[PDB]
Amino acid sequence: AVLRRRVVGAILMVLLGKATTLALPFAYKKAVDAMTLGGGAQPALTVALAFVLAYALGRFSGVLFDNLRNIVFERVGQDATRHLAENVFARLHKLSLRFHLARRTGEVTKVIERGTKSIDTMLYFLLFNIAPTVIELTAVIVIFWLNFGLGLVTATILAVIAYVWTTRTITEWRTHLREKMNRLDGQALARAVDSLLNYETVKYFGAESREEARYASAARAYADAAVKSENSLGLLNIAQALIVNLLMAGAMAWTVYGWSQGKLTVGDLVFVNTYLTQLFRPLDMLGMVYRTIRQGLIDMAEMFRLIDTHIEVADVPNAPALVVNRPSVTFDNVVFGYDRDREILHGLSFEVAAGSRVAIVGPSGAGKSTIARLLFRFYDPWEGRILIDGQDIAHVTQTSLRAALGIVPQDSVLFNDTIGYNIAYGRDGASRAEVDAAAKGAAIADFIARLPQGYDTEVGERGLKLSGGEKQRVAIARTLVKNPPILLFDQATSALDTRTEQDILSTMRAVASHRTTISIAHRLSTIADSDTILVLDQGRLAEQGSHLDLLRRDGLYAEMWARQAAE
Amino acid sequence: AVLRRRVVGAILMVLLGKATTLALPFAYKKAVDAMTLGGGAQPALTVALAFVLAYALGRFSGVLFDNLRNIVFERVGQDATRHLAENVFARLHKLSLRFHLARRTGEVTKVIERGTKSIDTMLYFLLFNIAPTVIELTAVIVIFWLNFGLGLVTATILAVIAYVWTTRTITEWRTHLREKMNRLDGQALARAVDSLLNYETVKYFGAESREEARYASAARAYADAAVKSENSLGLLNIAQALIVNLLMAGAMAWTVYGWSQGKLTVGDLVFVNTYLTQLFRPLDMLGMVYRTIRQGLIDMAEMFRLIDTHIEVADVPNAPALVVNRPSVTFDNVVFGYDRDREILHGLSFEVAAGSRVAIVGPSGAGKSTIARLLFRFYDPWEGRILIDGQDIAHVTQTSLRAALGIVPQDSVLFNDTIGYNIAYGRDGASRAEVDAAAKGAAIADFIARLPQGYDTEVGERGLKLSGGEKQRVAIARTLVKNPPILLFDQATSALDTRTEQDILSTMRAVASHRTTISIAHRLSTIADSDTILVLDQGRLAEQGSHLDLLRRDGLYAEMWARQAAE
Ligand SMILES: Nc1ncnc2c1ncn2[C@@H]1O[C@H](COP(=O)(O)OP(=O)(O)OP(=O)(O)O)[C@@H](O)[C@H]1O
Ligand SMILES: Nc1ncnc2c1ncn2[C@@H]1O[C@H](COP(=O)(O)OP(=O)(O)OP(=O)(O)O)[C@@H](O)[C@H]1O
């Protein structure tokens, strides 16, 4: 509502700058009163005073208006940037898991910040350089048609057309170097950020100099590309300057052609030269702003290509919610692979009973975390389907599905905040009672109590300032705070000692009264008291049954289990 | 290097630009002689043509010289930028682990980009706006001091002094808003990046809207700060423009006062106004050049201040190298805490014998990964010391120390590249034979062979496109490729099943026959066949000895072992 008023005032400030653009010809009137009635009279002094008022205030009136425009437009501009940024962030959290797994933080950060800065500059240039230069050029044309004639304006319009054509050709020739420079910079920053993510790895193998040289190669490649791009910019500027200066010469040469004095001996030449000076400004601004908006649209296209192309998992039209009356999982002939060149799950079918305690075991690489990810609908299966209480996961909203599921993941990450924030993250606005209950049920309560800052101790980036077992128990506390009707533990008790592991096992058994618990574990002794044990091998269900049943069948599970008994 | 020659040419271009600066007033003299003499009917036609030619050529040569300066300085600028970026990166990889653990990637990235963007334009402005304007001011003052009295020149210098006072006052008032805006933008970007790092966590607890609103709050805070900063910038610009335009008014008022035609010479007024315009063009830049170099140097000071913040672990002067004749490690009364408010290790002392296979066990939080980190000298101990073959770790170079150690870490991270790159990352220039041997000793050979892209399969960011056990085995392959004289496995077989765990254990036993192996493990069954077992409790050495000996002692180790036997 008020942004409209602000931009209206901005256009009015543009019109006041147009009043200054009028004031510059106004000195033509001074020049008219110079030769006809000059020395030996009163007007000889009138040239001075009226000049200062026209000049001193006039120039001051111009810039003062321009900056005022800025101060009345900044809120409109920043909001737009913010409105983009928030939207970008809102879309950034709606991208598929494949992207955020295969992403390169460096080049994607470059693309995001570049797109934001591009729209930030492009809105300003679109609102403050297109319309003002168009108005000024229209006024130039009408004033030279009412004061000079038809020939000069036609010569100037064809000169400007050749100028625009040359600019377009040079920009089409420069686009290649521009894109190459951008790609090289993105690759360099991606390499730098990925090296910094593996700081500990770089220290572990004495590979500081290797990474230094690796980044240096990309840096000098980008440097060469930028040299080429800026030299192309300089060439375009030299061409534009040649066009402008030859047009200036033609305009200053065709005025004295009729007579030595012309129609107006004093005033014609000053009108022409002032208009040439105030014409070099719109061409200098217009070429740069046209190519700037071109690059801004290409950066917006790049950014929005990265953003909007990522539509993997989506809700069906008018999708109902998940109604969890019985927390029962059903994999029906599930066929899935992450990439089409390697199938991972081959017709997997199993029924996790409602309110049961089912374990999922198998050798490394068998595809257990893929079962977890498919249950969460991070990916969709190729064939078959997944049911929760007889409801197809593919035909229900993602929010209601993921709300009914709580997972302690294989590789858990924490926010760079305090312990209490991460623990309370399970539910939106968790009370200290709930957070303390989860921290007590996760064998982490005494540890936090012995902490000097307690729930306010820092965990650092990804939670790496805590131990492995402490971080595991923090993730357990999060999933306890959430308390959904389907609990899933993907190697949850790996980083724990046997004592804390038995504590967490007693907890998991206590909170599984009428709720479903799916425990993926390689430490078989923890899942020995489960209702059913599903053994997975190369993406197929090898065996299924009780611990005693599978031990007696003497198949894959028994061997594995007996492989624990070897030591 | 050769860049010196380039900058010489750059200054030459600058002087050629000054050749244009002379030519614009120099032409006006030829126009002066049209009023009184030149009435042979020939010279009236010579003066005009020569003026037009001189003006067109002057302007075109000016822009041409400027662009040539740019094109001959671009290589020097890019070189400088690249060298700065490389230095920043090199120092970024030499900061302590405390920084990279407590760092916030967003605001640090903001600071880095700010410093780079500042230096890129700062060098250009320092070399092409400071020195040219200084030379122009010296020439203007020395030539105009013999033609004008004391009043005008002293008024101009006092006007410039008042200009400097106004600029300094407004900049000192704006520095606060600038720094606050910078801090808010850094915090907003840090929050956004930390939310994106926890993408999976945000998906696990349905907290998209929470993070969206959090970033939106930070964004609107930054928007308000930026609006304030830009309004302050506009106020400074209007003040500077007022000062400059009133000075031009005073210069165009005290010169026209003497006579209607000229105060002291025939061409006083036009010479004065031409030099005033050709000084106002560089002056309008100068009012932006002081704050640009000031804020660029102060942001450089901020960046390099943060970087130069004295690192934690450093080499002693003239530090010798580590000579591992017998890999026997000795923690002698090691007292350490990460923060001063919580001590972790309380007088820890233990002797890992040369060529033995020692295990480190204990409850979660006891401080075992702290033993590993102190052995790597990521931190220095408060009391006591650490010895490798009787040599103080604190008195030896960090590089030679970390070369003698190879670690499979608790939380392993891979580079966003192929599997083969990560495996070969161990040694500098590893042969494909060694990489295949490591992949065979890490139970991944058959897996990678069954991969369609084999060693060229992507692992994604942090290696999260591979499983947990696959990533563990890849890290084992790295540490095997490195082949150092002291191997340390911090919960290396956690993500593996018992079968692959026995494979990796057979590997660990095939290697390190007469080498030291320190295994930190919670899965006690794997370390039961060790030479000695160090039990750690709350940061102290509880017991030590053989599996049978500690089992006989019926202490902390036995209890833990018995806790596996619970049914
Ligand atoms: N981003 C990806 N691209 C391609 N394949 C993937 C990706 N993520 C997972 N996989 C597939 O998943 C399988 C390995 O992960 P899986 O889901 O088996 O984990 P897991 O068996 O739970 O891990 P572990 O038992 O090793 O701890 C392999 O078949 C692998 O191809
Ligand atoms: N930079 C730091 N600032 C504060 N505390 C830290 C820092 N780094 C580590 N710690 C603390 O050290 C402890 C972890 O040390 P360590 O990882 O050796 O435990 P652990 O017993 O070996 O782990 P686990 O046995 O659970 O794998 C935690 O209490 C953690 O808070």
Side-chain angles (χ1 to χ4, degrees):
Chain A
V2 200
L3 307 180
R4 179 194 60 88
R5 182 174 66 180
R6 284 194 178 94
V7 306
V8 165
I11 296 187
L12 290 187
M13 292 298 182
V14 169
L15 298 186
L16 272 180
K18 188 58 197 175
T20 296
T21 300
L22 296 175
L24 279 208
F26 196 88
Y28 175 97
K29 305 178 181 301
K30 314 278 195 42
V32 177
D33 304 336
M35 178 59 180
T36 57
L37 295 183
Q42 179 177 4
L45 194 270
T46 312
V47 178
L49 164 137
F51 185 76
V52 173
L53 183 70
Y55 206 80
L57 271 185
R59 302 216 62 179
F60 173 71
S61 65
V63 280
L64 182 271
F65 291 157
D66 300 333
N67 286 277
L68 280 185
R69 175 184 60 203
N70 295 15
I71 82 170
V72 306
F73 185 75
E74 282 300 318
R75 185 52 188 174
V76 180
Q78 299 288 346
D79 269 336
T81 67
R82 175 188 60 85
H83 267 283
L84 186 92
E86 290 181 14
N87 270 6
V88 169
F89 189 89
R91 298 177 186 185
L92 215 42
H93 263 290
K94 302 194 172 182
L95 304 184
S96 63
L97 181 55
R98 194 184 287 112
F99 175 75
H100 291 272
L101 284 182
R103 70 170 200 267
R104 308 186 171 269
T105 43
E107 55 187 18
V108 72
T109 296
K110 260 297 168 289
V111 169
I112 294 300
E113 302 209 23
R114 181 172 61 199
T116 306
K117 190 71 176 180
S118 67
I119 193 55
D120 186 16
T121 310
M122 176 181 171
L123 211 157
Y124 181 95
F125 274 165
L126 195 153
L127 273 63
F128 296 146
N129 272 183
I130 280 74
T133 49
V134 161
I135 292 294
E136 181 192 332
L137 199 64
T138 301
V140 164
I141 290 179
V142 300
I143 293 185
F144 289 173
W145 175 67
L146 293 178
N147 293 13
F148 294 85
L150 276 62
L152 190 57
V153 287
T154 56
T156 53
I157 67 169
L158 280 199
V160 175
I161 286 182
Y163 179 98
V164 168
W165 194 90
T166 52
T167 290
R168 175 171 292 184
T169 301
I170 298 302
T171 306
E172 199 185 344
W173 183 83
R174 187 179 58 96
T175 301
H176 170 264
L177 308 181
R178 200 78 169 183
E179 185 171 2
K180 196 169 181 174
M181 168 189 177
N182 283 332
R183 187 182 68 259
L184 291 192
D185 190 12
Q187 292 173 8
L189 187 57
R191 187 168 286 184
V193 177
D194 191 19
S195 58
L196 290 174
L197 293 183
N198 286 262
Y199 167 88
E200 299 178 1
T201 303
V202 173
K203 291 296 175 182
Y204 284 158
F205 304 112
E208 14 270 346
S209 37
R210 206 195 333 276
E211 297 289 343
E212 289 191 25
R214 208 181 163 96
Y215 170 71
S217 173
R220 50 184 51 102
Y222 162 70
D224 301 335
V227 166
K228 297 224 173 184
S229 180
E230 298 309 308
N231 291 10
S232 185
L233 166 66
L235 285 177
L236 179 53
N237 283 342
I238 290 179
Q240 295 175 344
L242 172 65
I243 297 302
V244 172
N245 294 289
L246 74 89
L247 182 55
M248 285 191 183
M252 289 187 59
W254 259 74
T255 53
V256 71
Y257 182 95
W259 274 89
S260 62
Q261 51 197 8
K263 308 305 176 182
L264 300 99
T265 162
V266 186
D268 267 315
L269 194 48
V270 183
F271 207 84
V272 162
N273 65 42
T274 49
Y275 263 85
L276 283 178
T277 54
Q278 269 203 326
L279 175 65
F280 172 71
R281 173 183 174 179
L283 278 186
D284 189 16
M285 295 186 79
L286 182 76
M288 192 169 183
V289 162
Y290 178 79
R291 66 195 175 201
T292 296
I293 295 184
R294 167 88 179 270
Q295 189 184 3
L297 274 180
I298 210 61
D299 293 353
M300 179 175 175
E302 163 74 11
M303 186 205 216
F304 288 57
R305 186 186 206 178
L306 185 152
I307 293 306
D308 292 349
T309 46
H310 290 99
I311 20 77
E312 197 169 349
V313 175
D315 288 355
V316 306
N318 303 319
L322 190 60
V323 194
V324 187
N325 282 80
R326 284 178 170 272
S328 64
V329 194
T330 303
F331 272 58
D332 182 25
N333 235 318
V334 165
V335 181
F336 165 78
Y338 292 76
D339 300 323
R340 190 58 66 168
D341 55 13
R342 178 151 92 99
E343 182 169 309
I344 294 331
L345 291 196
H346 324 285
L348 187 50
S349 290
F350 64 91
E351 236 292 336
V352 166
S356 69
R357 208 154 51 89
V358 180
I360 292 183
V361 303
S364 173
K368 322 159 308 162
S369 311
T370 203
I371 298 175
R373 290 184 211 180
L374 283 168
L375 186 53
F376 248 80
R377 199 171 159 76
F378 283 110
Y379 309 98
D380 271 324
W382 294 350
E383 306 172 19
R385 65 193 205 274
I386 298 173
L387 312 176
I388 286 180
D389 202 354
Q391 307 182 29
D392 200 328
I393 267 63
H395 309 336
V396 300
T397 61
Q398 297 174 56
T399 50
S400 71
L401 166 63
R402 303 192 181 105
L405 310 168
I407 168 184
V408 180
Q410 200 177 42
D411 292 317
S412 52
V413 287
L414 304 183
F415 299 88
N416 192 350
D417 207 345
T418 68
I419 298 189
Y421 179 57
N422 285 289
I423 302 187
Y425 204 86
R427 252 195 68 258
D428 192 4
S431 69
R432 281 70 182 167
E434 298 161 312
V435 186
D436 274 309
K440 197 177 188 62
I444 189 190
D446 287 3
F447 155 71
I448 308 173
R450 284 184 298 271
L451 288 179
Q453 299 299 134
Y455 281 59
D456 292 298
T457 45
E458 294 282 358
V459 313
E461 176 163 340
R462 286 180 33 199
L464 299 182
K465 300 191 76 170
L466 303 178
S467 90
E470 295 167 8
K471 179 191 211 185
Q472 283 294 333
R473 293 176 290 191
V474 165
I476 304 167
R478 309 182 316 186
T479 203
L480 287 177
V481 161
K482 181 177 183 185
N483 190 36
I486 295 174
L487 227 47
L488 205 154
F489 299 83
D490 188 10
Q491 198 69 25
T493 55
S494 66
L496 308 170
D497 54 286
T498 168
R499 173 209 301 277
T500 312
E501 183 175 49
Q502 282 277 0
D503 281 5
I504 303 288
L505 272 164
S506 53
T507 289
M508 289 187 291
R509 286 190 298 200
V511 208
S513 299
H514 109 101
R515 199 181 48 193
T516 303
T517 314
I518 297 176
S519 308
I520 298 173
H522 286 154
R523 211 168 298 185
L524 296 192
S525 50
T526 79
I527 47 88
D529 53 68
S530 312
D531 298 320
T532 49
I533 300 180
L534 312 160
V535 195
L536 205 70
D537 193 17
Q538 298 157 17
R540 197 172 281 98
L541 188 53
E543 315 177 274
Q544 177 178 358
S546 164
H547 167 274
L548 300 173
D549 302 4
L550 296 186
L551 211 69
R552 210 177 286 97
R553 293 175 63 171
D554 196 5
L556 174 54
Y557 177 85
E559 174 189 328
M560 288 193 56
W561 202 97
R563 202 136 289 172
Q564 293 183 162
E567 42 180 10
Chain B
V2 200
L3 307 179
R4 177 195 60 89
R5 181 174 65 181
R6 282 195 177 94
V7 307
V8 165
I11 296 187
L12 177 61
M13 303 316 303
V14 170
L15 299 185
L16 270 55
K18 293 160 184 165
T20 296
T21 299
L22 296 175
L24 202 157
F26 195 90
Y28 164 63
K29 191 267 175 182
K30 312 303 172 59
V32 179
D33 303 334
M35 171 184 176
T36 57
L37 194 55
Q42 179 70 2
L45 195 46
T46 312
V47 293
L49 296 189
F51 184 76
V52 173
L53 183 71
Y55 205 80
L57 269 56
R59 301 215 62 180
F60 174 72
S61 65
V63 193
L64 182 270
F65 293 156
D66 300 333
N67 286 277
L68 281 185
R69 176 185 62 252
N70 295 15
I71 298 180
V72 305
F73 185 75
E74 198 64 34
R75 186 53 188 174
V76 181
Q78 298 288 346
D79 270 336
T81 294
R82 176 188 60 85
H83 267 283
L84 187 92
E86 289 182 14
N87 269 7
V88 169
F89 187 89
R91 298 178 186 185
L92 216 43
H93 261 106
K94 303 193 172 182
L95 303 183
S96 63
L97 182 55
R98 195 186 289 265
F99 176 76
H100 292 272
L101 283 182
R103 70 170 201 267
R104 307 186 171 269
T105 44
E107 54 188 18
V108 178
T109 297
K110 264 298 168 181
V111 169
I112 295 301
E113 302 286 352
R114 181 175 62 199
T116 306
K117 189 71 176 180
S118 66
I119 192 55
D120 186 15
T121 310
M122 198 194 85
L123 212 158
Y124 180 89
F125 274 165
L126 195 152
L127 274 194
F128 295 146
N129 273 183
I130 282 300
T133 48
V134 161
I135 293 294
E136 180 192 332
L137 198 64
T138 53
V140 163
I141 289 179
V142 300
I143 293 185
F144 291 172
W145 174 66
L146 293 179
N147 293 13
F148 295 94
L150 275 61
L152 190 57
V153 287
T154 54
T156 299
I157 67 169
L158 282 198
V160 175
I161 286 182
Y163 180 95
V164 168
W165 190 90
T166 294
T167 289
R168 175 168 291 184
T169 301
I170 299 302
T171 306
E172 201 83 12
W173 192 270
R174 187 180 59 173
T175 301
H176 170 264
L177 308 181
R178 198 77 170 183
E179 185 170 2
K180 195 169 181 174
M181 167 189 173
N182 283 332
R183 282 292 185 175
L184 291 193
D185 191 12
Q187 292 173 8
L189 187 57
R191 187 167 285 184
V193 177
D194 191 69
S195 175
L196 290 174
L197 294 184
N198 287 262
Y199 167 88
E200 298 178 1
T201 303
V202 173
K203 291 296 175 182
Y204 285 159
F205 305 110
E208 287 79 345
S209 37
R210 205 192 331 193
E211 296 289 343
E212 289 191 25
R214 209 181 163 97
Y215 172 70
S217 299
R220 50 184 52 102
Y222 161 70
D224 301 335
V227 166
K228 296 222 174 183
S229 180
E230 298 309 308
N231 291 9
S232 186
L233 166 66
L235 285 177
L236 179 53
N237 283 342
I238 65 101
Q240 295 175 344
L242 172 65
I243 297 303
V244 172
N245 294 289
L246 74 88
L247 181 55
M248 184 154 300
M252 291 179 175
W254 195 72
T255 51
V256 70
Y257 181 61
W259 273 86
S260 174
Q261 51 197 8
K263 199 180 179 60
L264 278 80
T265 199
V266 193
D268 267 317
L269 306 179
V270 183
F271 208 84
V272 161
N273 66 42
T274 49
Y275 259 105
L276 282 178
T277 54
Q278 271 201 144
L279 175 65
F280 171 71
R281 176 180 176 178
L283 277 186
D284 190 16
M285 305 281 87
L286 182 76
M288 187 179 57
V289 162
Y290 175 79
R291 68 193 177 200
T292 296
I293 296 184
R294 164 88 180 271
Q295 190 182 167
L297 274 180
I298 210 61
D299 293 353
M300 204 146 316
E302 162 71 12
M303 174 204 279
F304 290 61
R305 187 185 71 182
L306 186 153
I307 294 306
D308 290 348
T309 46
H310 112 293
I311 318 179
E312 200 167 350
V313 174
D315 288 355
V316 307
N318 303 319
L322 191 61
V323 193
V324 187
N325 282 80
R326 282 177 169 272
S328 64
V329 193
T330 299
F331 273 58
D332 182 25
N333 233 318
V334 165
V335 182
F336 166 79
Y338 295 81
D339 300 324
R340 276 295 177 178
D341 55 13
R342 157 149 90 143
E343 183 169 309
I344 290 91
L345 291 196
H346 324 286
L348 186 50
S349 290
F350 64 91
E351 163 66 33
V352 165
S356 69
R357 208 154 52 89
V358 181
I360 292 183
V361 304
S364 173
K368 322 157 155 182
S369 311
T370 303
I371 299 176
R373 290 182 212 179
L374 283 168
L375 186 52
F376 237 82
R377 201 171 161 186
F378 283 108
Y379 308 98
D380 271 324
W382 294 350
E383 306 172 19
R385 65 193 205 274
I386 299 173
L387 311 175
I388 286 180
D389 202 354
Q391 308 181 29
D392 199 328
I393 267 63
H395 308 336
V396 181
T397 61
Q398 297 174 56
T399 50
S400 71
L401 165 63
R402 302 192 181 105
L405 310 169
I407 293 235
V408 187
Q410 200 177 42
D411 293 317
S412 309
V413 183
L414 305 184
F415 298 87
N416 192 350
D417 208 347
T418 68
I419 299 188
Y421 180 57
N422 285 289
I423 302 187
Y425 203 86
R427 260 196 178 104
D428 192 3
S431 69
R432 195 161 181 87
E434 298 161 312
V435 186
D436 275 309
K440 195 178 187 184
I444 38 190
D446 287 3
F447 156 71
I448 308 173
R450 284 184 297 271
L451 288 178
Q453 299 299 134
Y455 279 58
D456 293 298
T457 45
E458 295 283 358
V459 314
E461 177 163 340
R462 287 184 297 165
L464 299 182
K465 300 190 77 170
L466 303 178
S467 90
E470 294 167 8
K471 178 192 296 185
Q472 285 295 333
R473 293 177 290 190
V474 166
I476 304 167
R478 310 182 316 186
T479 203
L480 286 177
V481 162
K482 182 176 183 185
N483 191 37
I486 295 174
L487 227 46
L488 205 154
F489 300 83
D490 189 10
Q491 198 69 26
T493 55
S494 66
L496 307 170
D497 54 287
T498 169
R499 174 209 301 277
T500 312
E501 183 175 49
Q502 281 201 346
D503 280 4
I504 303 288
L505 273 164
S506 53
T507 288
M508 295 182 189
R509 287 213 58 164
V511 306
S513 298
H514 281 72
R515 197 178 47 193
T516 303
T517 314
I518 297 176
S519 308
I520 298 172
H522 287 154
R523 213 168 298 184
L524 296 192
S525 50
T526 80
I527 47 87
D529 53 68
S530 312
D531 298 321
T532 49
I533 300 180
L534 312 160
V535 195
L536 205 70
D537 193 17
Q538 297 156 17
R540 197 173 281 98
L541 188 54
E543 34 190 16
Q544 176 179 358
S546 165
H547 168 89
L548 299 173
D549 302 4
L550 297 186
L551 213 68
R552 212 186 292 100
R553 295 174 63 171
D554 195 5
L556 174 53
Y557 176 84
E559 174 188 328
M560 279 190 296
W561 200 97
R563 203 135 289 172
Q564 293 182 342
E567 56 188 4

